[PDB]
Every structure is written in C-alpha cells, then in structure tokens.
Ligand binder design. Structure first.
Ligand SMILES: Cc1ncc(CN2[C@@H](C)[C@H](CCOP(=O)(O)OP(=O)(O)O)S[C@@H]2[C@@](C)(O)C(=O)O)c(N)n1
Ligand SMILES: Cc1ncc(CN2[C@H](C)[C@H](CCOP(=O)(O)OP(=O)(O)O)S[C@@H]2[C@@](C)(O)C(=O)O)c(N)n1
Ligand code: SF4
Ligand code: SF4
Ligand code: SF4
Ligand SMILES: [Ca+2]
Ligand SMILES: [Mg+2]
Ligand SMILES: [Mg+2]
Lengths: 1231, 235, 118, 117, 58
C-alpha cells in the first residue's frame, strides 16, 4: 500500500532505488551524496529490497570507477543503480555508451548540478544531464519531491522491461534537498509491477561461464554501422513502455503522468515548455494568471529521451501561437540549447503550422526562478518577444536578459503560511525547523515544505530556513519572499542583513535578543527596522532566548525557545494542539538521560510561552532618524563586489561586474572581519617567552607577531604593551603578540600550546577584548613586518614573514590551514598552487572570499582549482609551461651573450643562466636585469626585458586532501611523481573525504567510523608514502605540526629544494574526526598521533643516496603505548566502542598491531645498507630513433593501429621460424 | 614560402600544431597517435617552432591527465596543444569545460573516431566530436588532407586572438590517413600571421606569483549564472 | 516455489573465478587508479597483467612499465626513468597476493602461481 | 623464486632492438643507460633478498565481523562533527552543537570558573 | 540542379553564414550527420539546421 512521510527528493528516490536494485557502485558528490549514504545506512539496518536481500553497496575510487563497476554488475546479471551528479556524471559518460550500447537495464539517479567552467558550483541545473544526452540512456525528469519518487519507480521498471538504461534526474538542491510531505509505495507494491518475464530474460542473457558469449568486440567498417543500428527496435519501444508504467504505477498511486503533460488554459495562446522543478512554479503562476483570464499554458517534459514528437504535440494546444522553451543550461556557441532544438525539430518535421518559438535560459547554479520571472517569460511572449533570453540575471553586457518586475503578486495558494528563519551556525535552528515540519505533517492534513539556504562559511555561518504550510499542494519551488512569519535567531544579524524584506503587513517578527527594555531596543534596533515594523503594523516580539535557556538549565542553548516561538506565533496550528504536540515530541526525542533533560525542555517551553508577549512600540518608530554610516575604508573591489555578495545582494550584481574568465583578485578576505569567535585569546606579556608558536599554529592567521623599533611605536595606542625583544639578533627591538580578535575563530589552539605553565595566552569573551584590540591590530598591521631579521625557515623567524593565506572560511581550529599558511611564509612570493577540489579549494576560494593574498611587493601564490581528479596533472602543466617559457628565456639570454650587449647586462645574463634554477641566484641576477633592461623595448634585450616575471625560479605546488591523493587523483599523482619533474605535492590527510561529509577514503584507518565504513573501516590505511618511495627518485616525507614544527619546516625546505618530485603528507585534524575536547586540541592531537606511533615521521631523500648515505630517515620514536587513549579521544573511534564494543576492541588492537609492524618496517628501512642510487640527469643530446630501425624481424603488425606514414617496408614477420631454424632449414634444403 | 609535399592528414595537421605550440601533453590513441609521435620525434630532432624553440612534449597517464596538464600549461601562459580521438576525447571533456570556461587559447587536434558502444571501433565518424559540442570549444572541420593543414593553422591563429579554445577535427583514417599531394606553409609564414598583441596579452593575464589572481573559485546561486554569461562577448 | 527458484539459479551453483586481464599500459598507467582500488578492496578477484613494457597495440609507445634505456615512442632516445615497481607497490598492502612469472624460465612456477593466486 | 643476477643482462638487452638501436645511434648514452639498468636490477634483487630474509611482516585477516548494524561518526560527539555548509547538509542534520568557537572543553570550563560571578 | 553546403565552423554555429551559402532556389535540403544519438529527435547538425530555418521565420 501507500504511506505518507515528509522527506527530500534524495530520500524519496533512494527509497525506490534501494527496493529495485541488487547492487550499487557509488562515489560521493554533492548534492547526490545523501542517496548513497542512506542506501548504506539501510543496508546496514537490514532493509530488504524486492528480492528480500540487503543491497550490496561498494564505494569506488571515482565515479569512473563506479560506472565501470555498474557496467560489470549489469553485464553479470544483477539489477544495478548509482547516484551521481555534475563532475561525476561526466566521468561516467564513457561507460554510459557501453551500458546503453549493450542494452543493460541500469538506472542512474542524478541530482542535476552545474558543471565547473569559469567556476565550480555544487548547485542545480541541467548542464550535467544534457552533457550525457547522446549516451543512449533514456532520460526521465521529475519536477518535485513526489515526482522524484514516482519517476524513480517508472525508470527502474521501464529499464528492466525495455533493456534501455535510464537516467532519472531531478534538480540539485531545489528538488534533492527540498522537504515535502509526500506519499511513497511499499516495496511489495513495487515488486508486483516488475515484469517477471523480462527479469528472467535479463538473468539468462548475462555473462556466465556456464553459457558464455563474447561482449565488447572490436569491429571494422564492414559491420560496425549495422551493429550500431541493431538496437533501433529497443529504442522505438521504450516510450510506450514508459507510458504503460506511468499508467500501471498511477493505478496504484492515483497520480497520472504522460511523456509530456499539459497544464493551463486549453485555449492558451502563449505556452512554456520546461523541465524540472521550474514546472511547479510555472504551474502555480498559471493557476493565478489563468484565473484572471490569461490564455497561458505549460508543457511539462517528463521523458526527455527518447524525444517523442507525437506525445509532445498531443500536449500542445492548437491555439498556441507563441511557444517559449526554457533550458536550464548553457552551450556556448550552439544555435540554441537542447530542449529548444528538440522542440524546433518537432515543428519542422510536422511541417504545418509554425507558431513563434522562443528560447529562454534560466536557473543556472540554482539561480532563483520565481513567479515574477515566469511573469516575465509570459509577458515577453505577448510583448517584445526577445529570443535567446536569460531570466534571473541582469545582462547589461550583451542585453539578453528579460526585465523582472519584483512587485509581482504573491501567487501561493489561498491559505499558505510562509516562514523564514535566520539562524547562526550550529544553533539548532535548521534542526528544529525539520522537526517542526515532521511534527506538523504527521499531525495535520496540511502539506508542508522546507528548504534551507546555508553559508559558504563553515563556521559561524548564517542559515536561512524557508518553510511553507498549507491546505493545498505546495508547488513553490523558489524561496519565500513575502513571509507571514519571520524569525531572527541571532541578534547580530539585525544591523547587518535585510531581515524583514518583503515581510507581509501584519506579519509576525520574532527576535532573539537581550534588548527587553524599550530603551535597549531603541538603542540597538536600526532605524530601518523600526520604520518597517511601524509602517507594517508588525506583530513584533522579543525574547531573550539566551536568558531563558540559561535559567531553565539549558545553558544559553536557544533552539527549544525559538521552536516554541514558532509553534505559538506562526499560526499554522491552534495554540492548544501546538504546545501539546511540541511537548509530546520532546518526550519522544530526548527522553534519554533521565527525566531531568526532559524537564528543562518542557519547562523552557512553558517559560517561552509565557515570556512570549507582543513587544509594544511607539508610533514614533514610523520615522526613526535614518542613521548615518560609520563604514570603514576598504578597496573598490570589496566595496562594489564582495561586500554586496556578503550581505546577500550578489543576485543584484549584473554580468558587467564579473571577469569573463571567472577570476578573482587575491586578498578580499582581509576586509571581512566577521567577529564570530565566542572567546578569543588575550596576551599576558608577563608570561610570554617570545617563541612565536601561537602564530605558527593559528588556523586563521589571527595572531600577529610584532617586532618594532622604538620609532615605529611612537603613535602607538597606550595599551600597545610591548616587551623588549629577547634574543641576540633582536637586541633593541620591541616585541608584541597582537591578537586579531575579529578574524579569530576562537578555537583555542594557540592558548593550548603556549609553552609557559603560567600561560601567556588566555581565552576571554570577544566583547572583553575587541574595543582594545581592534584599534591595536589596526595599528600593528601598519608596522613593517621584520622578515630580514631571522632565518625565514626557522620556527621563530617564519612568523616574522608575511603570511600569504589568511582569514579563510575553514572551520574554527581546522587542521589543514596552519600548514598552508606556513608554506606561504616560506615560498608564497614565488609559488603556483594547483589545488585539488576539496576543503582546501573550498576554504581556499569560495567566492567572494579570497584568503590567499599578496605580500607588500604585490607577489603572492598564483592559485588555481581545475578539477578534483586532475590536480597533479594540472600542476605538472604549469611546470611544463615554466619549463618551456624559461627555456625560451635561457635561449634568448645565451643568444644575447653573443651580441654587443653591455658588460653589465652580459654579467647579469651569465649570472642568471648559471643560477637559473636557484631561488636565491635567479632572483639576485633577475633583479639586476630588471634594473639594467628597464625601458628596453627593441630586439633581443627587449624580449628578455618583457619576460621578467620568469626571472626568479618558481615553486610549483599541488595541494590536495587524502581523498584526492589516495583515491580519485592517485593515478595522476603517481604519474606526475614518476616523471621526475620538479613539483611539490602537499597532501593534507584528514583520513576521510571531509568537505563532502566524512566519507571513507583509502586513507581512512582500520576501525575508523566514516560514511561507507559505518561499522569501522575493515581494511588498513593505504600506505601512500611507502608506495611512492619504491621509485627511489622522489623525495617523500611525513609531517605533524603538533609533534614538531621544526621537522615540518625542515621537510618543507628539503622537499622544495629537491630537484625532482616531492611528496609531503601531513596529519590534518578535522571536525569529522570528532576530537573529544575540541579542535583547540589539534596541535596536541597531532603530537600524540606521532608519539603513539600512529603517524610516524620520516623523510626519504634521494640525494643522500646519490652521496652513498641511506635516503630513508626516521624522525620519530617507537610507539609509546598511548595509541588507545589517542583513538578513544576521537569520536570516529569512540562511537564504535559504544556501539560495537566487541568489534571496536578488536579493531583498536588491530590498529595497534598495524602501527607496531609498520614502525618496525620503517626501522629496518632506516637500518638498511641496500638502497636505490642514481644521478639527477645526464644525456639528452639532439636526435631521435625509432624502436624498429634496423630490427632483424618485423617490429610492427599488419594492423591499421600500427600503420604510420613511414611503415610498409618488407620484413620478416616471424612466420618462418627463428633465424637459426631458417638457417638450418637452408642447409638441409641445400639442393 | 609554400612547399609541395605528399603526406597524410595527421602529418599535415601535426606540421602546423608543432609550429604554433610551445607545450603538448599527449596520450596515444588510434588514429591520432601519429601526430603526437611526430611532434615528439621532431622535438627530439631539435625542430623549432615559431618562437625558435623545440616543443615541450610529455606523455601523461591517460587523456584526462593530458587534458589537465594542457589546462595547467595554458593557465600558466604557454601556447598548448594535444592530439586525440574517441574514448580519449571523452576523458578530456571535464577539462574542456574549464579550458573554454577560463577562455584559454588551447587547440585540440582530433581525428574523429567512433565511440565504443555495442562494440569498439578505431574508425571514423563524428560520434566523439559531437559528444564534446557543449564544452564551449569552437569546432572547426576539415574535409581533406589539404584543409587539415589550412584549418589547423586557422584554428591556432583564431584561438590565440579570440581566447576561445579550438577543436580542429578531421575524419579518422578517411582523412587522417589518406595520402595526398598538398601544399604546406613555412613556419615563418605561419609566424607572420600571429596576433602578437593578443599573444602578449595571453601571457600577461596568465598565472604568475609575480602578479597573482585566483582562478577556479566555487560560486553560489547569487553569482554563478552572471559569471557564466560573462564570456558572451568572446563567443 | 522455492525449489523452482533455486532450480532457475543453477548457473550460480559453481563458485566462479573472476579474472581481470590487461597489459602494462592499463595496469601501470591509465587503469592503475582502478586496479589499485580494486586490489585494496580485499575482494576475491584475479588480476593478470601481460607486461610487454610498452603500449603494444597502438604502436609501441612507452608506459611506466618501460625500462630505463629502452627505445619506444615518447622515449626516442631511450627512456630516462626506470620501470615503475607496481609489484612492490601492491605488496605494501599486506593482504594482496602478488606474484611475478616468466614462462620461459619456469612453467612450473607459473602454474604454481596460478593455483596460489586463484 | 629466482636467483641473483647471473651477469648476462648485457647480452639480454643487446639481443633486443629496443636497446640495441640506441647503441647504434647514441652509443655513449646507451652504454650509460645499460649500466644503469644493470645497477637498478642489482639493487632491486638485493632488496628482494632482504624482503625474503626479514622476520617483520603483518598478520592476515581475511574477513569477519560486520556486526549487523552501523553508526554515524558524529553520533554522541562532544563538538559538531559537520560544518554549516550545504555540502554537509543531510536529512538528519541541524541539531545544535559546540562549533569550537568558544575554545577547548578545558578552556571553556576554566573561563566558567574564572567568571564564576 | 543540385548543391552542397560544406560546414567549416560547426561551433559557434552562425546561421547568417549558413544562409549566405544556401541557394534561394533550394526546395529540399538533406542534412547528413556522421553519428547516431539514440532516442534523439534528430542528430546534431540536423538539429542545428532546423533551428536556423525556424528562427528565420520565412
Ligand atoms: C569528479 C568528481 N567527483 C566528486 C566530486 C565531489 N568532491 C569530493 C568527493 C571532494 C572531497 C574531498 O576529499 P579530500 O579528502 O580530498 O579533501 P578534504 O577532506 O579536505 O575535503 S570535495 C568535492 C565538491 C565541492 O564538488 C562537493 O561535491 O561537495 C568532484 N568535485 N569531482
Ligand atoms: C581512454 C582511452 N585512451 C587510449 C586508448 C587507446 N588504447 C590503448 C592506448 C591500448 C594499448 C594498450 O596497451 P597495454 O600495454 O595496456 O596493452 P598491450 O601492450 O597488450 O597492447 S590499445 C587501445 C585502441 C584498440 O582503442 C586504439 O586506439 O588503437 C583507449 N582505448 N582509451
Ligand atoms: S583561538 Fe584559534 S583562531 Fe583564535 S588566535 Fe588562537 S589559534 Fe587562532
Ligand atoms: S606561544 Fe605564548 S609564550 Fe610563545 S610567543 Fe605566543 S604568547 Fe608568547
Ligand atoms: S578539513 Fe575539516 S576542519 Fe578543515 S575546513 Fe574541512 S571540514 Fe573543516
Ligand atoms: Ca621539489
Ligand atoms: Mg580528506
Ligand atoms: Mg603492453
């Protein structure tokens, strides 16, 4: 039978996919990740599929790997599915041709997401699914959560009966992450629809040595074409099969579908053709406008491939005179996007009435497609009739955009209550909204919808919840813009974001703040808000959620209080039932540790209900004094681009505001100054031993060491306390540790590792520190950084260099950023960074925040993110460029040495040439050439003068996480390191795919809990270091900051100076590991990681072998027996102990045994006397030679594959035997 | 000057590609292998391109690696090329979106070959080039050994001046391996057709720590769409 | 019923032997990432690599399996880097069965390895 | 399963055109490279001999365990194990937690003690 | 009375240049695609040509 539930598109389709598949080969990619993870969870819980079995699910190394596995499973006779999107779908394309080419019933469920071009987007659009429209897969689109469920079922059933693989897709986030109350079928109902005859035929034709066949032959021109057309019959029948299953499923659900469905006026004159979630919004607008008499309609595309023109026309009103086809993609240079071209083709082949056809583009990267935009589209059809337009953006560059009137009337059905909640990261707002949706949906007949907007910031980010409740189906697939209820859970937002925008008149505005008194409110509430509340007669409520939570014992935790506010004031339910239901549920959930935790929550509810009174305000708010504008100084770019985006106005930036190639300038994060740390450090100079370890360790570059001369401290604020500098080389300098309180994330690592027993750093509330430190950091920032005093690569001296990566969006206490920041302090001014997609690319470059910056001379890391799978090859390419361009420069230089260039110029050239690959010398002489050739514009000296940005030796680095290095990019990494070229690979090992949600990677350790290893990973951690060391010519090393900063610096210097490939693997802590005492213990955890023997440190240096010494050196000591407490101090290990104590004990013992063995193997490596030795190069010499020249026998075959321009000469093809056999035969045949 | 020679489509194309590129990341795949092998032998023989330099050619682990290297070389300011077909071109698709997306003057010379479906085939058809039509690469076809030479040259010249990568393609075997007596141009002649200012501009906007920028950001719904339409003036 | 279903699954009665055949170009280069992951999975599969020390079919191009000094396409003056040690790399797992064979040297060791690997 | 190099490598290589053609075209480099190959295999065999002589090797666990069930790595974690990102968003995510913006457990507790009030 | 339009620049597809090569006398036009996209309403070149005639409106 049926069953109601409130869930998202992902779960709705995974529900069906699990039931219908026996095997799933998967790989994580947002926003489809949820499906694979649920399937895994259900298989582990014991959920049965229609065959009464738990799903066999395996995580591959990439989507390409998953696609080949899917093909193998299907070829081998097992119903198979996979979940993917965007970049991942692209990697599956080659196997798609094979899966459809071999008529296999596979089903791919795709959360349609944008492809990375000028930029990467995890958001929704059809660029990915259209990229695969030629693979031969049938394509069924679902446009709503309820449809994702239905279409997923049709796809599987039709795939099984048709023998044509299906791609079931729905919009990324807009449908995959939207919550709706829907109806799902029982697995037994799905099972009943399966064509048993077809299933048996599938089984019988599959690969099997009992009745084998050959698949995947290589064919010549004589038969290939015929073989390709032999599947025709199958594709002619899929449409009818899809129709029949839509009907068979409908008889069970009551929901009918056609390949193309029509809604709107039967006599519509203007019709839109669309696909995906846009269809719901368009329909909602049609109901509204048609009720006013407008003759408009919409054709919803269900089956996109095969494209059946007959079914399309069956849905087209004869009265349509103008048709607009909406494509949610962009194919540069094409005469029109996919859907548009298909529709145009239908009309030309029909050969009759040709209504006006227009093409429109919308929703790229989940761009809003709101009711007003639909109005634009319909108005365009009766108005200008612009063709190839875009809607949702202002294209002031090519003028392709339709103007959009946002005063358009709200079109949600009568009786819909709309809500918006503004929350702060981890304050539980989203969780309570999802709970509120469940509660309301399970206890009323109301339809409920939820959608959530998050922040690119991983910590202290702002969240915005959009909820809708109604007596009628909610087709609003766009954000709420005219809310009945608006709640701001963070009082900090009040002054910075337009929180009451579009709120209805008489709407309810609930605010969390301690401004209970009218004077306090008048003191904080901006004029604009007061005027808005006033002029709209808003039901304004204020509630000190933090005081109530504290008092009832919930310790400032506000979720329950704000939750109560919603259930009481939103008005979707009567008070009695609400408070009732809310309470019943508190007992449901919680109900754990005694009735005490239940009491506090229940009490908090009653206290909330009571204290929840309408804040009364003076009519004088009608015109509160429009405040001035105490806006600090920044730059034009931050003023005109990033600030607008950070304040959520990016949607208003026209196309003219962006660089055609998507680039961004460095350093835009310098001005964010978010100030979201709860507690920040306070320097206690009386205990400071002036070590610079606190600055070295900061994950956000929030600590600024200061070394000034007396003169530089004259205009210094009174509180700018500075110690006289310790150290011989610092005699006479004044030292200060300046805390950047607004950029601090308040993790506590600095304070945690500050050497002195009597700490020089103590955590304190941000407010107790900002007034003094803000003007202090400001002043210190203008003090020249003393980079020339101490060695750049010394612990202390490194912190006297300019950090070139600051204030990133990484989590508070992130274990990756400290390493990167230091790397820039050592090479920043001359590095190229090819960054693999992952956390490091996300905190590294989530527009509009750019943490990497330039130094005082304008030099900084040239940073780029290509893809997730190609970081190494990307960096190798940059290295090829430098080789080619610098070789060109060298050639010009030698050339100019043989000319009448001046003695000085020649000295410089000769100097540069000799020190070409030396950072010190190439810069020394390049800087002379810059001076010496200044102005030179002609001839040879002119070309050399124009290549100055190539004078100093560059440092190419490849940054990537473990998922990249051990999995998807391993092949690339391996090849690049094997090239022997001069590149540097820095792997930030978090032992999981962090960014995407903690999925297991081959870097995940034995027994660690992570997605797809939820019972603890049952294979040991892949030994990347030892695998790379077998080459002998690659510098390999491991590091752990918390264990030894010096060893880290030593490794950086040795790896970078190695004239060949270098691989550095760093232990990076991460919130996914669940450090028990907080991330502020990362350094200490890194310390233990090494002491326990879990993460041994070593260095493999090939040049030592070149000089007779052992290249391998251990840098840490044998395991000290602390591994158990090390593991148990991380939830990724502790959860297993609490859930499966028996296996967890076993797995922790296995880990201790693994590390013990590994260390002993490393000890012998370091003791060995036998080692691979070799020189840096030697050889080359102009010239080439073919492997076949002068061979005694044919060296190439008779194939089209080996044919070359010069091939074809006669030769002995080995059909007459050996040279000796032929000789002996010759003597024997003397005659 | 012009020179009368008797060769096939691969060679006629390779003749030009070598002259116009500084860097090449290759991977072998019939029927385009001949091109990369020729480029490699010529570089090893010391042949000079239009900059008087021998080509910097490296063999990657696959075409995906070759395409990522090509993207990196172009991003770092080196005129770059590659040769491929069929299954190999499919592997380059992810990077193709990035190369065109970042308006890079890359040039792929493709010997159009069938895609493996019910069977593999090393022979010619446009299945592969059509699979890459939405990548944003301009696509210029040559229908004869003589046009392969001419379009190859046009593709390079146009990619440099337009900042839109080009895919120069011709029929696998039917053109790539057909031998014809044709005319080819001297490298000097090709060099004189190059837009020197566009080229200087390509190098000045390339990745360099001396004057850095960030490329390949991650963008939200607020600006992605605008950012994708920003390249219209180029197309 | 049940016996009918079981009767219909007879082509699954006998334990099967899953083999993956490929050359050095596949195993050392393009398919290395996948080969590596599949071996790390710990599942019962058998990989048999026919190492010709070049991409043979396509015309003798070098691969990471090509040895130092061997001439091949893209190694026209002799390859200047040594052969990649795929065997020792995979042995680092500890749970993968790895072996090398050479028929001309020992047909018996070849047969012994087949039996042990399978 | 085989023995130490018997010294026939030079003849081995020179009997194959892939090596000999180099000898005829770039005699000097070829000489170097064949000696390099001889050194490479000498070392490798020596490394394999130690591998065969070692007493250091790790246990072999085929399979076994699974323990019908699974758990999320964030379950019962003291601090948030996921970020505010749409990438980490999941159906069951959204519950309040300590986002590490207030410092260590120890640092937090001490600030409590120090601000007793 | 027959003709042939040779496609040089397939992308970007410029309809103006396509029509600059089309004879006004052409009553029937066959578009040949050297590919197969199973289930598509037509192959790539054909689809592009159709769009050209549809947008022209003549
Ligand atoms: C071809 C392909 N497959 C999948 C993805 C999805 N991605 C991943 C699985 C990356 C996880 C990174 O792992 P690791 O270990 O290298 O780094 P770290 O732990 O530091 O994060 S983040 C990323 C993205 C942004 O698109 C998304 O889907 O969230 C992708 N970009 N490309
Ligand atoms: C993605 C991709 N890149 C390139 C090729 C081209 N192919 C190769 C480079 C294969 C050579 C394989 O070498 P190796 O060492 O693994 O095996 P062996 O030496 O035994 O031959 S034969 C083949 C093909 C048939 O399609 C072609 O282009 O000719 C391909 N099929 N797919
Ligand atoms: S608490 Fe963390 S973010 Fe703040 S200064 Fe210290 S190390 Fe940096
Ligand atoms: S870690 Fe502590 S002692 Fe060292 S420089 Fe920083 S504040 Fe001073
Ligand atoms: S690596 Fe972990 S701690 Fe760092 S930004 Fe990513 S999720 Fe956060
Ligand atoms: Ca190096
Ligand atoms: Mg990771
Ligand atoms: Mg081979």
């Amino acid at each position: 039978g049926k069953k109601m539930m409130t869930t998202d598109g992902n779960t709705a389709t995974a529900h069906v996919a699990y039931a219908m598949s026996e095997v799933a080969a998967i790989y994580p990619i947002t926003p489809s990740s949820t499906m694979g993870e649920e399937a895994d969870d259900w298989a582990a819980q014991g959920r049965k599929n229609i065959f009464g079995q738990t799903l066999t699910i395996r995580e591959m190394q990439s989507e390409a790997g998953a696609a080949g596995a899917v093909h193998g499973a299907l070829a081998a006779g097992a119903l198979t599915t996979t979940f993917t999107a965007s970049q991942g779908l692209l990697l599956m394309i080659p196997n798609m041709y094979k899966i459809s080419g071999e008529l296999l019933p596979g089903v791919f469920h795709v959360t349609a997401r944008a492809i990375a071009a000028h930029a990467l987007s995890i958001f929704g659009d059809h660029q990915d699914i259209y990229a695969a429209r030629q693979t031969g897969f049938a394509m069924l689109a679902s446009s709503s959560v309820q449809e994702a469920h239905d279409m997923a079922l049709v796809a599987h059933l039709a795939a099984i009966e048709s023998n044509v693989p299906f791609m079931h897709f729905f919009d990324g986030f807009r449908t995959s992450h939207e919550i709706q109350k829907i109806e799902v079928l029982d697995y037994a109902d799905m099972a009943s629809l399966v064509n048993q005859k077809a299933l048996a035929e599938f089984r019988a034709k599959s690969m099997n040595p009992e009745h084998p066949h050959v698949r995947g032959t290589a064919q010549n021109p004589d038969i290939y074409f015929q073989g390709r057309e032999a599947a025709n019959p199958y594709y002619l029948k899929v449409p009818g099969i899809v129709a029949e299953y839509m009907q068979k499923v409908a008889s069970l659900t009551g929901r009918s579908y056609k390949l193309f469905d029509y809604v709107g006026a039967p006599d519509a004159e203007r019709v839109i053709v669309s696909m995906g979630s846009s269809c719901e919004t368009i329909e909602e607008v049609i109901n509204h406008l048609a009720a006013k008499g407008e003759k408009i309609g919409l054709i919803k595309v269900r089956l996109y491939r095969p494209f059946v023109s007959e079914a399309f026309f069956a849905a087209l009103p004869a009265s349509a005179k103008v048709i607009t086809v909406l494509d949610r993609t962009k194919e540069p240079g094409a005469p029109g996007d996919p859907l548009y071209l298909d529709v145009c083709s239908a009309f030309v082949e029909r050969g009759e009435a040709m209504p006006k056809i227009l093409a429109g583009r919308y929703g790229l990267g989940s761009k809003e497609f709101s009711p007003a935009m639909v109005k634009s589209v319909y108005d365009n059809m009766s108005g200008a009739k612009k063709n190839h337009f875009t809607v949702g953006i202002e294209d002031d560059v090519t003028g392709t955009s339709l103007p959009v009137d946002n005063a358009f009337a709200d079109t949600t059905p009568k009786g819909t209550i709309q809500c918006q909640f503004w929350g702060l990261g981890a304050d539980g707002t989203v969780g309570a909204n999802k709970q509120a949706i469940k509660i309301i949906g399970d206890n009323t007949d109301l339809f409920a919808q939820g959608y959530f907007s998050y922040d690119s910031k991983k910590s202290g980010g702002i969240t915005i919840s959009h909820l809708r409740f109604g007596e009628k189906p909610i087709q609003s697939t766009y954000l709420v813009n005219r809310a009945d209820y608006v709640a701001c859970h963070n009082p900090a937002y009040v002054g910075i974001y337009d929180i009451l925008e579009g709120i209805k008149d008489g709407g309810t505005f609930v605010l969390n703040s301690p401004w209970s008194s009218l004077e306090d409110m008048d003191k904080h509430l901006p004029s604009g808000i007061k005027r808005t509340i006033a002029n709209k007669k808003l039901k304004f409520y204020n509630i000190d959620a933090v005081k109530i939570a504290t008092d009832v014992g919930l310790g400032g935790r506000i979720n329950m209080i704000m939750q109560t506010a919603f259930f009481k004031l939103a008005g979707v339910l009567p008070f009695e039932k609400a408070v009732d239901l809310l309470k019943k549920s508190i007992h449901k959930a919680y109900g754990k540790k005694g009735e005490k935790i239940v009491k506090m929550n229940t009490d908090a509810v009653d206290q909330a209900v009571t204290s929840l009174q309408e804040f009364k305000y003076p009519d004088s708010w009608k015109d509160a004094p429009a405040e001035t504008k105490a806006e600090p100084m920044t730059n034009e770019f931050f003023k005109n681009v990033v600030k607008p985006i950070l304040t959520q106005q990016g949607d208003k930036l026209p196309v003219s505001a962006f660089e055609a190639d998507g680039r961004f300038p460095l350093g835009t994060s310098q001005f964010e100054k978010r100030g979201v740390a709860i507690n920040v450090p306070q320097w206690v100079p009386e205990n400071c031993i002036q070590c610079n370890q606190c600055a070295f360790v900061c994950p956000h570059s929030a600590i600024l060491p200061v070394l000034a001369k007396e003169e530089e401290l004259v205009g210094a604020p009174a509180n700018f306390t500075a110690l006289e500098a310790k150290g011989k080389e610092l005699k006479g300098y004044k030292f200060r540790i300046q805390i950047n309180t607004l950029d601090c994330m308040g993790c506590g690592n600095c304070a945690d590792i500050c050497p002195p027993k009597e700490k020089a750093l103590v955590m304190q509330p941000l407010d107790t520190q900002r007034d003094a430190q803000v003007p202090n950091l400001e002043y210190a920032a203008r003090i020249p950084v003393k980079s020339e005093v101490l060695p750049r690569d010394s612990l202390k001296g490194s912190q006297f260099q300019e950090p070139l990566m600051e204030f990133s969006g990484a989590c508070s206490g992130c274990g990756e950023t400290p390493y990167v920041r230091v790397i820039t302090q050592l090479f920043g001014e001359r590095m190229f960074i090819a960054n693999a997609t992952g956390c490091s690319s996300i905190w590294g470059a989530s527009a509009p925040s750019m943490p990497y910056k330039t130094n005082r001379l304008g030099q900084g890391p040239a940073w780029g993110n290509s893809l997730f799978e190609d970081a190494a090859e990307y960096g190798f390419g940059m290295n090829m460029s430098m080789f080619a361009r610098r070789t060109h420069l060298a050639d010009l230089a030698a050339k100019a040495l043989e000319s009448d260039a001046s003695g000085d110029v020649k000295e410089a050239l000769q100097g540069w040439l000799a020190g070409k690959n030396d950072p010190i010398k190439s810069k020394e002489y390049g800087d002379k050439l810059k001076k010496l050739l200044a102005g030179q514009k002609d001839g040879l000296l002119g070309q050399i003068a124009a290549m100055s940005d190539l004078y100093t030796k560059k440092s190419v680095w490849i940054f990537g996480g473990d998922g990249w290095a051990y999995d998807i990019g391993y092949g690339g990494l391996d090849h690049v390191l094997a090239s022997g070229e001069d590149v540097n690979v820095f792997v930030m090992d978090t032992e999981v795919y962090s960014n995407t949600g903690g999925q297991s990677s081959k870097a995940t350790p034995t027994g660690a809990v992570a997605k797809f290893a939820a019972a603890g990973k049952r294979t040991g951690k892949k030994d990347l270091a030892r695998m790379v060391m077998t080459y002998g010519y690659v510098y390999v090393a491991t590091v752990s900051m918390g264990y030894s900063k010096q060893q880290f610096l030593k490794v950086l210097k040795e790896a970078e100076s190695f004239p060949g490939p270098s691989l550095v693997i760093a232990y990076a802590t991460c919130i996914n590991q669940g450090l028990r005492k907080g991330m502020g213990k990362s350094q200490d955890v890194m310390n233990t990681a090494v002491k326990s023997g879990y993460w041994p440190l070593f260095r493999y240096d090939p040049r030592l072998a070149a000089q007779g010494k052992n290249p391998f050196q251990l840098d840490s000591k044998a395991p000290d027996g602390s591994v158990e407490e090390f593991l148990m101090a991380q939830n990724r290990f502790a959860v297993l102990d609490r859930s499966f104590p028996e296996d967890a004990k076993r797995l922790r013992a296995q880990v201790a045994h693994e590390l013990d063995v590994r260390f002993k193997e490393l000890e012998h490596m370091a003791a060995t006397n036998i080692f691979e030795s070799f020189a840096p190069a030697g050889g080359k010499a102009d010239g080439s030679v073919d492997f076949g020249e002068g061979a005694e026998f044919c060296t190439r075959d008779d194939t089209p594959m080996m044919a070359r321009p010069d091939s074809g000469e006669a030769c002995d093809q080995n059909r007459a035997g050996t040279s000796e056999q032929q000789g002996d035969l010759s003597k024997r045949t003397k005659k």
